[PDB]
């Protein structure tokens, strides 16, 4: 019977890629029902998407465009959706028995809260939002132990790759973010592939003076800066640890400039399995919705002969010290990942806005990490989410204070 | 608790690699019990293996060294194995309730017959003998339909790779050589990787001149003579295309040969969503063998971890069919079906050996094979399993004789 889907952040990158692959797949046979759309504040696009997909639920976060939305939707003949607003609408969608799978394609607070409510409702959650895993991994783990039928399915491309390499007869004995995931799946080590970003050929003296322009000039600005500093991969290392329970000494970052091998899993016998395709978000999103099955697509087949050459090299931790900081934070454990994520949000934005230099990014983050003290990890879910929010806010303030002191 | 294993061809490449990985895996826990070792005629080597592993059963095919084996084994104290010979010995081993899984590391008739008996006794058959599959594919499918608990698990490195790339949640719902395997596993296409052999970069003028010594000498990877010649002509890959078809029920138009000269990626599967999964490692027989014996599980090894950064570069290209016409012949034979794969295999056996022995030139190999294929007239497929085996053997013998006759004439 159908796959019933809600998209949170439907006008974002994840959201439109999801709707694209759904639409295309549905042309081949009707497998997907788009039951709910949720957007922040693109009331117009949401209306356009509603025309096409006609979900039972519409929701917009911003109350200031709530009335407008309702007014635009009247124009659609033969259509009486449930139209909702804000956090309250979010919760209603997540509690709907008609929804099976929820795509989280929003970031930050909205991202963690929708994820939380989707888990509390025992749904399958297709999560792209790595910062929520890095920052609030312990909270997600606890929730997933309370809500036994909820599952997080990874959509971040490298993590999708890893997941796609597994035997689902073993996956089904566990789930992502569970202790012992790697043990049950016989995983030994992970090769986490990277584009390497724009600065792999730059000397230290060149990196000293690179600018945000040099990094941007195709994805969002924040992830683009993180790809430039390789803090994206550093966050993706922590994401791997949490999703798959792989030790940090068994995660290896490898620079694969062609971006065809998306990542690789070494099993305990030392056999390596990898997932490969053109650089792509459609397959990761689609697999999150079809797992543990696959369905036909009309995607272009990989032409391995035409690709011709694949290359792999080790990243320099001197040139990309954000990688080292991510490992350090993850190995220290506790809430150090929360602090890393929060301090990077500030340092990334400073650099983006030409306030600091490349090596200042890692300097600031390092100084924030050094000032944090491990805290007792709460057993209680509500207390734990509070600790994470408090630490997150502290680390942002601290990063800002270190910036302002030097400046 | 322990997996009880028989090894057919224990002193060949597959056999020696099997006992090496088994030994390592057995260091602490009793993971495997080596219950039976069989060889064709290497009686001295089998004795030495018997000393170490002390299997319940020993068997030599060559009855002329049966007495020598019994006399060597009397040297081993507090050991009273069952010592057998010939096809009767093969049959007794395959029939033993004390055996769970059988590694077939022997070729030609002994490979086919041991495979057959192993299936007829509902065993797990870890099959490295690709020629059995090419020659007797439909017969094996029929036997596997009769003996419902038997399984063929592939050991040929590329086929092991394909198998590993599949999702075992689907694999467990079917089995190799079963109709609908590719549908159940959501397979779209196979990239069947090849080393490309020693002659991959030769011009046509250069290639006309090659000899067996050129194929055999300073080889990157040292293997048996027959397979080394087939790697050189890429008939090995042609056989492996047919092997892929039969193991995985993949259509010939959905099997693509790719020359990957680094031999790290061992083969790839494209699923119906166009996602591709590959299996990679150093060139290696230990993981394929081990996985055939542990599937659907994996166990710890102390093999060297792949260092992808050190490998640094992986390359892919399409082989030239003008330079490697054996590939074309294999596809043609497979697509024709019937007993054309049997004929391809038998004629190649002859042509390979003529070239090995310096009696014909490189392009004469494919010429002879093609002439035998064109000579063969399709036959009604026997419905009875025993009739079908007898038909296969008749056609195999005919094709070898026809190849020899062609050589004799143009000579
Ligand atoms: O984390 C990421 C972005 C950062 C990593 C990266 C960058 C570039 C290619 C591959 C990977 P990084 O290794 O530099 O840190 N992904 O998961 C890539 C997803 C999108 C790739 C395809 C696509 C579709 C549309 C626009 C643009 C791209
Ligand atoms: O069919 C084959 C041999 C032919 C193919 C080949 C040749 C060379 C490397 C890889 C592949 P082909 O592509 O040229 O036809 N395999 O499956 C060989 C796999 C294990 C080779 C490594 C090894 C381990 C132990 C002893 C000796 C060697
Ligand atoms: Ca004798
Ligand atoms: Ca698998
Ligand atoms: Ca097809
Ligand atoms: Mn990513
Ligand atoms: Mn092979």
PDB file of N, CA and C in Angstrom, chain A residues 164-170 172 186 191 254 261 264 266-277 283 286 292-302 304-305 308-314, chain B residues 164 166-170 172 186 191 258 265 268 270-281 287 290-291 296-306 308-309 312-318:
ATOM      1  N   UNK A 164      23.387   2.185   3.131  1.00  0.00           N
ATOM      2  CA  UNK A 164      23.059   1.417   1.933  1.00  0.00           C
ATOM      3  C   UNK A 164      23.974   0.211   1.723  1.00  0.00           C
ATOM      4  N   UNK A 165      25.141   0.205   2.362  1.00  0.00           N
ATOM      5  CA  UNK A 165      26.106  -0.878   2.230  1.00  0.00           C
ATOM      6  C   UNK A 165      25.801  -2.050   3.157  1.00  0.00           C
ATOM      7  N   UNK A 166      24.806  -1.905   4.032  1.00  0.00           N
ATOM      8  CA  UNK A 166      24.601  -2.873   5.111  1.00  0.00           C
ATOM      9  C   UNK A 166      23.618  -3.938   4.681  1.00  0.00           C
ATOM     10  N   UNK A 167      23.655  -5.065   5.403  1.00  0.00           N
ATOM     11  CA  UNK A 167      22.663  -6.089   5.224  1.00  0.00           C
ATOM     12  C   UNK A 167      21.492  -5.777   6.128  1.00  0.00           C
ATOM     13  N   UNK A 168      20.301  -5.686   5.528  1.00  0.00           N
ATOM     14  CA  UNK A 168      19.183  -5.150   6.285  1.00  0.00           C
ATOM     15  C   UNK A 168      18.661  -6.205   7.243  1.00  0.00           C
ATOM     16  N   UNK A 169      19.061  -7.463   7.056  1.00  0.00           N
ATOM     17  CA  UNK A 169      18.689  -8.481   8.000  1.00  0.00           C
ATOM     18  C   UNK A 169      19.396  -8.211   9.330  1.00  0.00           C
ATOM     19  N   UNK A 170      20.568  -7.597   9.269  1.00  0.00           N
ATOM     20  CA  UNK A 170      21.276  -7.172  10.476  1.00  0.00           C
ATOM     21  C   UNK A 170      20.795  -5.811  10.945  1.00  0.00           C
ATOM     22  N   UNK A 172      17.873  -4.632  10.840  1.00  0.00           N
ATOM     23  CA  UNK A 172      16.557  -4.758  11.434  1.00  0.00           C
ATOM     24  C   UNK A 172      16.639  -5.307  12.851  1.00  0.00           C
ATOM     25  N   UNK A 186      28.495  -6.067  12.261  1.00  0.00           N
ATOM     26  CA  UNK A 186      29.868  -6.518  11.974  1.00  0.00           C
ATOM     27  C   UNK A 186      30.743  -5.442  11.315  1.00  0.00           C
ATOM     28  N   UNK A 191      35.252   4.504   5.976  1.00  0.00           N
ATOM     29  CA  UNK A 191      35.932   5.459   5.095  1.00  0.00           C
ATOM     30  C   UNK A 191      34.904   6.524   4.770  1.00  0.00           C
ATOM     31  N   UNK A 254      38.689  10.507   3.987  1.00  0.00           N
ATOM     32  CA  UNK A 254      39.488  10.383   2.775  1.00  0.00           C
ATOM     33  C   UNK A 254      38.978  11.385   1.744  1.00  0.00           C
ATOM     34  N   UNK A 261      32.402   7.654  -5.281  1.00  0.00           N
ATOM     35  CA  UNK A 261      32.288   6.826  -4.093  1.00  0.00           C
ATOM     36  C   UNK A 261      31.803   7.746  -2.965  1.00  0.00           C
ATOM     37  N   UNK A 264      32.419   4.309   2.418  1.00  0.00           N
ATOM     38  CA  UNK A 264      32.712   2.883   2.365  1.00  0.00           C
ATOM     39  C   UNK A 264      32.718   2.342   3.782  1.00  0.00           C
ATOM     40  N   UNK A 266      34.159  -0.870   6.014  1.00  0.00           N
ATOM     41  CA  UNK A 266      34.989  -2.052   6.234  1.00  0.00           C
ATOM     42  C   UNK A 266      34.359  -2.926   7.318  1.00  0.00           C
ATOM     43  N   UNK A 267      34.031  -4.164   6.973  1.00  0.00           N
ATOM     44  CA  UNK A 267      33.520  -5.137   7.944  1.00  0.00           C
ATOM     45  C   UNK A 267      34.679  -5.829   8.641  1.00  0.00           C
ATOM     46  N   UNK A 268      34.312  -6.634   9.656  1.00  0.00           N
ATOM     47  CA  UNK A 268      35.289  -7.206  10.552  1.00  0.00           C
ATOM     48  C   UNK A 268      36.229  -8.198   9.862  1.00  0.00           C
ATOM     49  N   UNK A 269      35.817  -8.779   8.720  1.00  0.00           N
ATOM     50  CA  UNK A 269      36.653  -9.670   7.928  1.00  0.00           C
ATOM     51  C   UNK A 269      37.628  -8.891   7.037  1.00  0.00           C
ATOM     52  N   UNK A 270      37.430  -7.573   6.978  1.00  0.00           N
ATOM     53  CA  UNK A 270      38.201  -6.567   6.223  1.00  0.00           C
ATOM     54  C   UNK A 270      37.664  -6.398   4.805  1.00  0.00           C
ATOM     55  N   UNK A 271      36.531  -7.007   4.487  1.00  0.00           N
ATOM     56  CA  UNK A 271      35.878  -6.744   3.225  1.00  0.00           C
ATOM     57  C   UNK A 271      35.336  -5.317   3.275  1.00  0.00           C
ATOM     58  N   UNK A 272      35.455  -4.555   2.182  1.00  0.00           N
ATOM     59  CA  UNK A 272      34.947  -3.192   2.126  1.00  0.00           C
ATOM     60  C   UNK A 272      33.810  -3.131   1.119  1.00  0.00           C
ATOM     61  N   UNK A 273      32.685  -2.502   1.526  1.00  0.00           N
ATOM     62  CA  UNK A 273      31.586  -2.314   0.622  1.00  0.00           C
ATOM     63  C   UNK A 273      31.350  -0.806   0.542  1.00  0.00           C
ATOM     64  N   UNK A 274      31.058  -0.293  -0.648  1.00  0.00           N
ATOM     65  CA  UNK A 274      30.842   1.138  -0.856  1.00  0.00           C
ATOM     66  C   UNK A 274      29.605   1.349  -1.691  1.00  0.00           C
ATOM     67  N   UNK A 275      29.095   2.589  -1.577  1.00  0.00           N
ATOM     68  CA  UNK A 275      28.001   3.023  -2.393  1.00  0.00           C
ATOM     69  C   UNK A 275      28.541   4.125  -3.309  1.00  0.00           C
ATOM     70  N   UNK A 276      28.124   4.059  -4.563  1.00  0.00           N
ATOM     71  CA  UNK A 276      28.618   4.980  -5.581  1.00  0.00           C
ATOM     72  C   UNK A 276      27.489   5.378  -6.524  1.00  0.00           C
ATOM     73  N   UNK A 277      27.593   6.625  -6.996  1.00  0.00           N
ATOM     74  CA  UNK A 277      26.646   7.230  -7.922  1.00  0.00           C
ATOM     75  C   UNK A 277      27.251   8.588  -8.299  1.00  0.00           C
ATOM     76  N   UNK A 283      19.045   9.943  -4.517  1.00  0.00           N
ATOM     77  CA  UNK A 283      19.059   8.589  -4.034  1.00  0.00           C
ATOM     78  C   UNK A 283      19.059   8.546  -2.512  1.00  0.00           C
ATOM     79  N   UNK A 286      15.534   9.256  -1.441  1.00  0.00           N
ATOM     80  CA  UNK A 286      14.612   8.207  -1.830  1.00  0.00           C
ATOM     81  C   UNK A 286      14.820   6.954  -0.972  1.00  0.00           C
ATOM     82  N   UNK A 292      13.305  -0.729   4.024  1.00  0.00           N
ATOM     83  CA  UNK A 292      14.439  -1.519   3.494  1.00  0.00           C
ATOM     84  C   UNK A 292      14.349  -2.041   2.062  1.00  0.00           C
ATOM     85  N   UNK A 293      13.496  -1.414   1.253  1.00  0.00           N
ATOM     86  CA  UNK A 293      13.338  -1.793  -0.137  1.00  0.00           C
ATOM     87  C   UNK A 293      13.997  -0.717  -1.006  1.00  0.00           C
ATOM     88  N   UNK A 294      14.027  -0.980  -2.307  1.00  0.00           N
ATOM     89  CA  UNK A 294      14.366   0.019  -3.300  1.00  0.00           C
ATOM     90  C   UNK A 294      13.283  -0.040  -4.348  1.00  0.00           C
ATOM     91  N   UNK A 295      13.098   1.083  -5.062  1.00  0.00           N
ATOM     92  CA  UNK A 295      12.130   1.162  -6.148  1.00  0.00           C
ATOM     93  C   UNK A 295      12.820   1.716  -7.394  1.00  0.00           C
ATOM     94  N   UNK A 296      12.177   1.484  -8.542  1.00  0.00           N
ATOM     95  CA  UNK A 296      12.691   1.962  -9.803  1.00  0.00           C
ATOM     96  C   UNK A 296      12.733   3.482  -9.831  1.00  0.00           C
ATOM     97  N   UNK A 297      13.838   4.009 -10.369  1.00  0.00           N
ATOM     98  CA  UNK A 297      13.957   5.383 -10.788  1.00  0.00           C
ATOM     99  C   UNK A 297      14.304   5.450 -12.270  1.00  0.00           C
ATOM    100  N   UNK A 298      14.150   6.660 -12.803  1.00  0.00           N
ATOM    101  CA  UNK A 298      14.572   7.008 -14.145  1.00  0.00           C
ATOM    102  C   UNK A 298      15.843   7.839 -14.089  1.00  0.00           C
ATOM    103  N   UNK A 299      16.686   7.638 -13.055  1.00  0.00           N
ATOM    104  CA  UNK A 299      17.920   8.393 -12.909  1.00  0.00           C
ATOM    105  C   UNK A 299      18.923   7.904 -13.960  1.00  0.00           C
ATOM    106  N   UNK A 300      19.872   8.759 -14.310  1.00  0.00           N
ATOM    107  CA  UNK A 300      20.879   8.407 -15.300  1.00  0.00           C
ATOM    108  C   UNK A 300      21.778   7.318 -14.725  1.00  0.00           C
ATOM    109  N   UNK A 301      21.999   6.211 -15.442  1.00  0.00           N
ATOM    110  CA  UNK A 301      22.869   5.171 -14.900  1.00  0.00           C
ATOM    111  C   UNK A 301      24.302   5.700 -14.868  1.00  0.00           C
ATOM    112  N   UNK A 302      25.030   5.330 -13.804  1.00  0.00           N
ATOM    113  CA  UNK A 302      26.443   5.626 -13.687  1.00  0.00           C
ATOM    114  C   UNK A 302      27.161   4.966 -14.859  1.00  0.00           C
ATOM    115  N   UNK A 304      30.641   4.079 -15.428  1.00  0.00           N
ATOM    116  CA  UNK A 304      31.925   3.958 -14.764  1.00  0.00           C
ATOM    117  C   UNK A 304      33.068   4.148 -15.766  1.00  0.00           C
ATOM    118  N   UNK A 305      32.945   3.600 -16.975  1.00  0.00           N
ATOM    119  CA  UNK A 305      33.969   3.822 -18.006  1.00  0.00           C
ATOM    120  C   UNK A 305      34.147   5.288 -18.329  1.00  0.00           C
ATOM    121  N   UNK A 308      36.002   7.053 -15.536  1.00  0.00           N
ATOM    122  CA  UNK A 308      37.348   6.686 -15.973  1.00  0.00           C
ATOM    123  C   UNK A 308      38.347   6.580 -14.817  1.00  0.00           C
ATOM    124  N   UNK A 309      38.470   7.616 -13.978  1.00  0.00           N
ATOM    125  CA  UNK A 309      39.441   7.674 -12.895  1.00  0.00           C
ATOM    126  C   UNK A 309      38.782   8.117 -11.572  1.00  0.00           C
ATOM    127  N   UNK A 310      39.085   7.404 -10.469  1.00  0.00           N
ATOM    128  CA  UNK A 310      38.768   7.842  -9.115  1.00  0.00           C
ATOM    129  C   UNK A 310      40.060   8.006  -8.311  1.00  0.00           C
ATOM    130  N   UNK A 311      40.144   9.060  -7.463  1.00  0.00           N
ATOM    131  CA  UNK A 311      41.353   9.310  -6.687  1.00  0.00           C
ATOM    132  C   UNK A 311      41.026   9.490  -5.206  1.00  0.00           C
ATOM    133  N   UNK A 312      42.000   9.105  -4.374  1.00  0.00           N
ATOM    134  CA  UNK A 312      41.841   9.117  -2.917  1.00  0.00           C
ATOM    135  C   UNK A 312      43.132   9.633  -2.297  1.00  0.00           C
ATOM    136  N   UNK A 313      43.031  10.583  -1.366  1.00  0.00           N
ATOM    137  CA  UNK A 313      44.167  11.015  -0.584  1.00  0.00           C
ATOM    138  C   UNK A 313      43.758  11.396   0.831  1.00  0.00           C
ATOM    139  N   UNK A 314      44.750  11.350   1.733  1.00  0.00           N
ATOM    140  CA  UNK A 314      44.583  11.783   3.111  1.00  0.00           C
ATOM    141  C   UNK A 314      44.496  13.311   3.210  1.00  0.00           C
TER     142      UNK A 314
ATOM    143  N   UNK B 164      28.202 -10.183  -2.109  1.00  0.00           N
ATOM    144  CA  UNK B 164      28.378  -9.342  -0.939  1.00  0.00           C
ATOM    145  C   UNK B 164      27.671  -7.980  -1.070  1.00  0.00           C
ATOM    146  N   UNK B 166      24.881  -7.418  -2.453  1.00  0.00           N
ATOM    147  CA  UNK B 166      23.445  -7.596  -2.284  1.00  0.00           C
ATOM    148  C   UNK B 166      23.079  -7.411  -0.827  1.00  0.00           C
ATOM    149  N   UNK B 167      21.791  -7.153  -0.625  1.00  0.00           N
ATOM    150  CA  UNK B 167      21.233  -7.068   0.714  1.00  0.00           C
ATOM    151  C   UNK B 167      20.764  -8.435   1.211  1.00  0.00           C
ATOM    152  N   UNK B 168      21.397  -8.989   2.248  1.00  0.00           N
ATOM    153  CA  UNK B 168      21.102 -10.358   2.654  1.00  0.00           C
ATOM    154  C   UNK B 168      19.638 -10.548   3.101  1.00  0.00           C
ATOM    155  N   UNK B 169      18.937  -9.457   3.438  1.00  0.00           N
ATOM    156  CA  UNK B 169      17.513  -9.546   3.743  1.00  0.00           C
ATOM    157  C   UNK B 169      16.749 -10.014   2.494  1.00  0.00           C
ATOM    158  N   UNK B 170      17.238  -9.665   1.282  1.00  0.00           N
ATOM    159  CA  UNK B 170      16.636 -10.171   0.052  1.00  0.00           C
ATOM    160  C   UNK B 170      17.254 -11.530  -0.300  1.00  0.00           C
ATOM    161  N   UNK B 172      18.288 -13.919   1.421  1.00  0.00           N
ATOM    162  CA  UNK B 172      17.804 -15.020   2.228  1.00  0.00           C
ATOM    163  C   UNK B 172      16.463 -15.538   1.717  1.00  0.00           C
ATOM    164  N   UNK B 186      16.360  -6.784  -6.606  1.00  0.00           N
ATOM    165  CA  UNK B 186      16.234  -5.442  -7.149  1.00  0.00           C
ATOM    166  C   UNK B 186      17.457  -5.092  -7.987  1.00  0.00           C
ATOM    167  N   UNK B 191      28.271  -4.519 -13.098  1.00  0.00           N
ATOM    168  CA  UNK B 191      29.597  -4.180 -13.580  1.00  0.00           C
ATOM    169  C   UNK B 191      30.544  -5.321 -13.174  1.00  0.00           C
ATOM    170  N   UNK B 258      34.069  -4.451 -17.275  1.00  0.00           N
ATOM    171  CA  UNK B 258      34.845  -3.220 -17.094  1.00  0.00           C
ATOM    172  C   UNK B 258      36.263  -3.614 -16.693  1.00  0.00           C
ATOM    173  N   UNK B 265      38.457  -2.730  -6.668  1.00  0.00           N
ATOM    174  CA  UNK B 265      37.034  -2.979  -6.813  1.00  0.00           C
ATOM    175  C   UNK B 265      36.861  -4.295  -7.537  1.00  0.00           C
ATOM    176  N   UNK B 268      30.570  -4.706  -9.093  1.00  0.00           N
ATOM    177  CA  UNK B 268      29.579  -3.750  -8.603  1.00  0.00           C
ATOM    178  C   UNK B 268      28.200  -4.201  -9.042  1.00  0.00           C
ATOM    179  N   UNK B 270      24.382  -2.481  -9.829  1.00  0.00           N
ATOM    180  CA  UNK B 270      23.468  -1.356  -9.932  1.00  0.00           C
ATOM    181  C   UNK B 270      22.065  -1.891  -9.603  1.00  0.00           C
ATOM    182  N   UNK B 271      21.404  -1.273  -8.633  1.00  0.00           N
ATOM    183  CA  UNK B 271      20.027  -1.631  -8.305  1.00  0.00           C
ATOM    184  C   UNK B 271      19.052  -0.787  -9.123  1.00  0.00           C
ATOM    185  N   UNK B 272      17.747  -1.097  -8.995  1.00  0.00           N
ATOM    186  CA  UNK B 272      16.718  -0.518  -9.848  1.00  0.00           C
ATOM    187  C   UNK B 272      16.544   0.973  -9.617  1.00  0.00           C
ATOM    188  N   UNK B 273      17.059   1.510  -8.503  1.00  0.00           N
ATOM    189  CA  UNK B 273      17.001   2.947  -8.267  1.00  0.00           C
ATOM    190  C   UNK B 273      18.219   3.672  -8.877  1.00  0.00           C
ATOM    191  N   UNK B 274      19.181   2.874  -9.386  1.00  0.00           N
ATOM    192  CA  UNK B 274      20.410   3.321 -10.047  1.00  0.00           C
ATOM    193  C   UNK B 274      21.514   3.572  -9.017  1.00  0.00           C
ATOM    194  N   UNK B 275      21.247   3.260  -7.731  1.00  0.00           N
ATOM    195  CA  UNK B 275      22.314   3.207  -6.757  1.00  0.00           C
ATOM    196  C   UNK B 275      23.261   2.040  -7.076  1.00  0.00           C
ATOM    197  N   UNK B 276      24.570   2.278  -6.964  1.00  0.00           N
ATOM    198  CA  UNK B 276      25.528   1.210  -7.188  1.00  0.00           C
ATOM    199  C   UNK B 276      26.250   0.851  -5.905  1.00  0.00           C
ATOM    200  N   UNK B 277      26.408  -0.457  -5.634  1.00  0.00           N
ATOM    201  CA  UNK B 277      27.164  -0.952  -4.488  1.00  0.00           C
ATOM    202  C   UNK B 277      28.309  -1.803  -5.048  1.00  0.00           C
ATOM    203  N   UNK B 278      29.520  -1.546  -4.509  1.00  0.00           N
ATOM    204  CA  UNK B 278      30.702  -2.290  -4.876  1.00  0.00           C
ATOM    205  C   UNK B 278      31.340  -2.967  -3.679  1.00  0.00           C
ATOM    206  N   UNK B 279      32.148  -3.988  -3.953  1.00  0.00           N
ATOM    207  CA  UNK B 279      32.923  -4.669  -2.934  1.00  0.00           C
ATOM    208  C   UNK B 279      34.400  -4.550  -3.363  1.00  0.00           C
ATOM    209  N   UNK B 280      35.230  -4.147  -2.416  1.00  0.00           N
ATOM    210  CA  UNK B 280      36.617  -3.857  -2.701  1.00  0.00           C
ATOM    211  C   UNK B 280      37.524  -4.401  -1.590  1.00  0.00           C
ATOM    212  N   UNK B 281      38.764  -4.740  -2.014  1.00  0.00           N
ATOM    213  CA  UNK B 281      39.769  -5.218  -1.110  1.00  0.00           C
ATOM    214  C   UNK B 281      41.006  -5.391  -1.977  1.00  0.00           C
ATOM    215  N   UNK B 287      38.946 -13.660   1.485  1.00  0.00           N
ATOM    216  CA  UNK B 287      37.663 -13.131   1.910  1.00  0.00           C
ATOM    217  C   UNK B 287      36.552 -13.867   1.170  1.00  0.00           C
ATOM    218  N   UNK B 290      36.191 -17.314   2.871  1.00  0.00           N
ATOM    219  CA  UNK B 290      35.677 -17.203   4.204  1.00  0.00           C
ATOM    220  C   UNK B 290      34.195 -16.828   4.189  1.00  0.00           C
ATOM    221  N   UNK B 291      33.851 -15.851   3.348  1.00  0.00           N
ATOM    222  CA  UNK B 291      32.479 -15.402   3.318  1.00  0.00           C
ATOM    223  C   UNK B 291      31.545 -16.505   2.851  1.00  0.00           C
ATOM    224  N   UNK B 296      25.239 -16.187   6.269  1.00  0.00           N
ATOM    225  CA  UNK B 296      25.077 -14.743   6.130  1.00  0.00           C
ATOM    226  C   UNK B 296      25.803 -13.914   7.183  1.00  0.00           C
ATOM    227  N   UNK B 297      26.734 -14.510   7.904  1.00  0.00           N
ATOM    228  CA  UNK B 297      27.506 -13.770   8.874  1.00  0.00           C
ATOM    229  C   UNK B 297      28.891 -13.460   8.345  1.00  0.00           C
ATOM    230  N   UNK B 298      29.574 -12.601   9.095  1.00  0.00           N
ATOM    231  CA  UNK B 298      30.975 -12.289   8.867  1.00  0.00           C
ATOM    232  C   UNK B 298      31.706 -12.470  10.167  1.00  0.00           C
ATOM    233  N   UNK B 299      32.961 -12.936  10.064  1.00  0.00           N
ATOM    234  CA  UNK B 299      33.784 -13.074  11.250  1.00  0.00           C
ATOM    235  C   UNK B 299      35.077 -12.289  11.116  1.00  0.00           C
ATOM    236  N   UNK B 300      35.708 -12.047  12.266  1.00  0.00           N
ATOM    237  CA  UNK B 300      36.925 -11.267  12.335  1.00  0.00           C
ATOM    238  C   UNK B 300      38.071 -11.969  11.607  1.00  0.00           C
ATOM    239  N   UNK B 301      38.832 -11.199  10.826  1.00  0.00           N
ATOM    240  CA  UNK B 301      40.111 -11.686  10.325  1.00  0.00           C
ATOM    241  C   UNK B 301      41.230 -10.739  10.731  1.00  0.00           C
ATOM    242  N   UNK B 302      42.466 -11.205  10.549  1.00  0.00           N
ATOM    243  CA  UNK B 302      43.595 -10.335  10.771  1.00  0.00           C
ATOM    244  C   UNK B 302      44.235  -9.934   9.446  1.00  0.00           C
ATOM    245  N   UNK B 303      43.460  -9.915   8.361  1.00  0.00           N
ATOM    246  CA  UNK B 303      43.943  -9.439   7.083  1.00  0.00           C
ATOM    247  C   UNK B 303      44.320  -7.959   7.174  1.00  0.00           C
ATOM    248  N   UNK B 304      45.265  -7.551   6.330  1.00  0.00           N
ATOM    249  CA  UNK B 304      45.703  -6.185   6.218  1.00  0.00           C
ATOM    250  C   UNK B 304      44.555  -5.290   5.778  1.00  0.00           C
ATOM    251  N   UNK B 305      44.259  -4.222   6.518  1.00  0.00           N
ATOM    252  CA  UNK B 305      43.182  -3.308   6.112  1.00  0.00           C
ATOM    253  C   UNK B 305      43.550  -2.608   4.822  1.00  0.00           C
ATOM    254  N   UNK B 306      42.563  -2.504   3.939  1.00  0.00           N
ATOM    255  CA  UNK B 306      42.700  -1.699   2.725  1.00  0.00           C
ATOM    256  C   UNK B 306      43.124  -0.281   3.080  1.00  0.00           C
ATOM    257  N   UNK B 308      43.200   2.837   1.167  1.00  0.00           N
ATOM    258  CA  UNK B 308      42.703   3.462  -0.039  1.00  0.00           C
ATOM    259  C   UNK B 308      43.580   4.649  -0.442  1.00  0.00           C
ATOM    260  N   UNK B 309      44.080   5.420   0.531  1.00  0.00           N
ATOM    261  CA  UNK B 309      44.930   6.554   0.243  1.00  0.00           C
ATOM    262  C   UNK B 309      46.210   6.091  -0.443  1.00  0.00           C
ATOM    263  N   UNK B 312      45.487   5.042  -3.930  1.00  0.00           N
ATOM    264  CA  UNK B 312      45.437   6.391  -4.479  1.00  0.00           C
ATOM    265  C   UNK B 312      44.604   6.575  -5.746  1.00  0.00           C
ATOM    266  N   UNK B 313      44.643   5.635  -6.680  1.00  0.00           N
ATOM    267  CA  UNK B 313      44.035   5.834  -7.981  1.00  0.00           C
ATOM    268  C   UNK B 313      43.374   4.528  -8.425  1.00  0.00           C
ATOM    269  N   UNK B 314      42.127   4.629  -8.905  1.00  0.00           N
ATOM    270  CA  UNK B 314      41.377   3.530  -9.495  1.00  0.00           C
ATOM    271  C   UNK B 314      40.946   3.918 -10.897  1.00  0.00           C
ATOM    272  N   UNK B 315      41.076   2.999 -11.852  1.00  0.00           N
ATOM    273  CA  UNK B 315      40.767   3.332 -13.234  1.00  0.00           C
ATOM    274  C   UNK B 315      39.812   2.289 -13.792  1.00  0.00           C
ATOM    275  N   UNK B 316      39.068   2.711 -14.811  1.00  0.00           N
ATOM    276  CA  UNK B 316      38.021   1.929 -15.453  1.00  0.00           C
ATOM    277  C   UNK B 316      38.009   2.226 -16.953  1.00  0.00           C
ATOM    278  N   UNK B 317      37.988   1.148 -17.766  1.00  0.00           N
ATOM    279  CA  UNK B 317      37.672   1.300 -19.176  1.00  0.00           C
ATOM    280  C   UNK B 317      36.983   0.056 -19.730  1.00  0.00           C
ATOM    281  N   UNK B 318      36.357   0.236 -20.900  1.00  0.00           N
ATOM    282  CA  UNK B 318      35.736  -0.871 -21.609  1.00  0.00           C
ATOM    283  C   UNK B 318      36.777  -1.677 -22.390  1.00  0.00           C
TER     284      UNK B 318
END
